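Quick one - inputs below.
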Amino acid sequence: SNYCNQMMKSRNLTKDRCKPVNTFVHESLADVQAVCSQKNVACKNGQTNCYQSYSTMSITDCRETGSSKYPNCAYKTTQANKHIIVACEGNPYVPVHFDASV
Amino acid sequence: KETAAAKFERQHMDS
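Output:
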């Protein structure tokens, strides 16, 4: 429950501002990269190179509290099991953008 | 400048 506060920091997500929302995925890298060969769907931005994971994945939702303030960025850590949706690109075809989870 | 794939791991991967 202090996870998001550490994680946002170790991953340089609180460098100049506090990243409001951020999602971390706890599956193997291999499983997450495999999503690129799963259900093809529209990205929020309108491109058509997003994919949704056939399976729910173990994830963690990091959202800043209403009271948080740089440099002491504060986060609510919510764990969840959800289908993720990533944009894939390049060779190897791998995720390059987290898009959403359902 | 960090390959977009690296960025995604730094940002969303905690295996």
